[PDB]
Amino acid sequence: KLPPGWEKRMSRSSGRVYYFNHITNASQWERPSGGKNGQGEPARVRCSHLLVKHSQSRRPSSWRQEKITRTKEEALELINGYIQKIKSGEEDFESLASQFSDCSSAKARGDLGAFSRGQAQKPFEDASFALRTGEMSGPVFTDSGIHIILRTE
């Protein structure tokens, strides 16, 4: 049971049950499903993303800063912060992407438009196609940096 990638897990050093997606790295308290079969994955998806780059990114530069110097660890902290802010309701994904994404797609509020498999880096692609419409990923690591991905179509 559960849709692709999803497993019921428990927090360590704690003990709360939650649900984790091994492909998108999403975590949530809510069971991800409440009978459709042979549905497979979509042939095309549209996504927005918020990218946080770090010193080890394939291109450690962005419209936000000539030279990205933050560490991968510091980038992950930022990503975790943005996810928390979006889930709390204090911020919205598009506003954060417009302001803080290291990708040039910040100018389109994070929107990358529609794409097919073979078009993006593997971890980004796998996460995007494993998201259902309206879902947000957890931290997704690629050679570019660390992404939060929102599937819009």
Swiss-Prot record:
Residues 1-34 form the WW domain. Residues 28-44 are annotated as: Disordered. Residues 42-153 form the PpiC domain. It is found in: Nucleus; Nucleus speckle; Cytoplasm. The keyword Acetylation applies. The modification Phosphoserine is found at S61, S98. It is an enzyme of class 5 (isomerase). Interacts with STIL. Interacts with KIF20B. Interacts with NEK6. Interacts (via WW domain) with PRKX. Interacts with BTK. Interacts (via PpiC domain) with DAPK1. Interacts with the phosphorylated form of RAF1. Interacts (via WW domain) with ATCAY; upon NGF stimulation. Interacts with PML (isoform PML-4). Interacts with BCL6. Interacts with FBXW7, disrupting FBXW7 dimerization and promoting FBXW7 autoubiquitination and degradation. Directly interacts with RBBP8/CtIP; this interaction depends upon RBBP8 phosphorylation. The modification N6-acetyllysine is found at K36. Peptidyl-prolyl cis/trans isomerase (PPIase) that binds to and isomerizes specific phosphorylated Ser/Thr-Pro (pSer/Thr-Pro) motifs. By inducing conformational changes in a subset of phosphorylated proteins, acts as a molecular switch in multiple cellular processes. Displays a preference for acidic residues located N-terminally to the proline bond to be isomerized. Regulates mitosis presumably by interacting with NIMA and attenuating its mitosis-promoting activity. Down-regulates kinase activity of BTK. Changing W29A: Loss of binding to phosphorylated target proteins, including to phosphorylated RBBP8/CtIP; decrease in DNA repair of double-strand breaks by homologous recombination less efficient than that observed with wild-type protein. GO terms for biological process: cellular response to hypoxia; negative regulation of amyloid-beta formation; negative regulation of cell motility; negative regulation of ERK1 and ERK2 cascade; negative regulation of protein binding; negative regulation of protein catabolic process; negative regulation of SMAD protein signal transduction; negative regulation of transforming growth factor beta receptor signaling pathway. The keyword ATP-binding does not apply. This is Peptidyl-prolyl cis-trans isomerase NIMA-interacting 1. SUPFAM superfamilies: FKBP-like, WW domain. One of its GO terms (molecular function) is cytoskeletal motor activity. Its main location: nucleus. Phosphorylation at Ser-61 by DAPK1 results in inhibition of its catalytic activity, nuclear localization, and its ability to induce centrosome amplification, chromosome instability and cell transformation. Ser-61 is dephosphorylated upon IL33-stimulation of dendritic cells. Its EC number is 5.2.1.8. It catalyses: [protein]-peptidylproline (omega=180) = [protein]-peptidylproline (omega=0). Keywords: Acetylation, Cell cycle, Cytoplasm, Isomerase, Nucleus, Phosphoprotein, Rotamase. It comes from Homo sapiens (Human). GO terms for cellular component: ciliary basal body; cytoplasm; cytosol; glutamatergic synapse; midbody; nuclear speck; nucleoplasm; nucleus. Expressed in immune cells in the lung (at protein level). The phosphorylated form at Ser-61 is expressed in normal breast tissue cells but not in breast cancer cells. SMART domains: WW.
